[PDB]
Design a protein around this ligand. Structure first.
Ligand code: A1BKA
Length: 167
């Protein structure tokens, strides 16, 4: 039993809710919140900009030190950093950005990072400003993630389409 509330159950392990991941994180304080990161951990917009703003820029400060030490992530890769005031940990996961020409096949590799954590609050990877079809992202999630994932979808119109079209 966990503290996630109001989710529709999609499969054995995947749950979905129309919710602002920032507000959801602040309420649940999950062990792991997933950020829709880029390889530079520059959290300017989309989910990343919103999560970072909610940390009063502490996420960005921590991220800049991480990059200065380790260099950029790989597309499809991840790193674990602090969750600040939102979660115990933040898993920064880089899905491919279609508006940069990156191979959509890397979306499965990106979701594989979720399997290293028993329970996660997450957005749909590569959705929103990353340019991929959120319906496809949900399919890859369900077919790749085996751990328990709670998906927060900001847009209500999108949430309804994802549910109604789910196979
Ligand atoms: F860049 C994106 C990368 C991945 C997914 C999404 C992106 O764009 C921003 C809007 N989306 C959100 N989804 C869930 N929680 C959210 N909180 C604020 C925005 C937001 C979808």
């Amino acid at each position: 039993v966990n503290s996630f509330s109001g989710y529709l159950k999609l499969t054995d392990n995947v749950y979905i809710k129309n919710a602002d991941i920032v507000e959801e994180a602040k309420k649940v304080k999950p062990t792991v919140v997933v950020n829709a990161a880029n390889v530079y951990l520059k959290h300017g917009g989309g989910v990343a900009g919103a999560l970072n703003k909610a940390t009063n820029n502490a996420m960005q400060v921590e991220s800049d030190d991480y990059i200065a030490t380790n260099g950029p992530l790989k597309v499809g890769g991840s790193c674990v950093l602090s969750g600040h005031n939102l979660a115990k940990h933040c898993l920064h996961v880089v899905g491919p950005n279609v508006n940069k020409g990156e191979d959509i096949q890397l979306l499965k590799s990106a979701y594989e990072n979720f399997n290293q954590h028993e329970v996660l609050l997450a957005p749909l990877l590569s959705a929103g400003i990353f340019g991929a079809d959120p319906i496809h992202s949900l399919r890859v999630c369900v077919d790749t993630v085996r751990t328990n994932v709670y998906l927060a979808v900001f847009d209500k119109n999108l949430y309804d389409k994802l549910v109604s079209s789910f196979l």
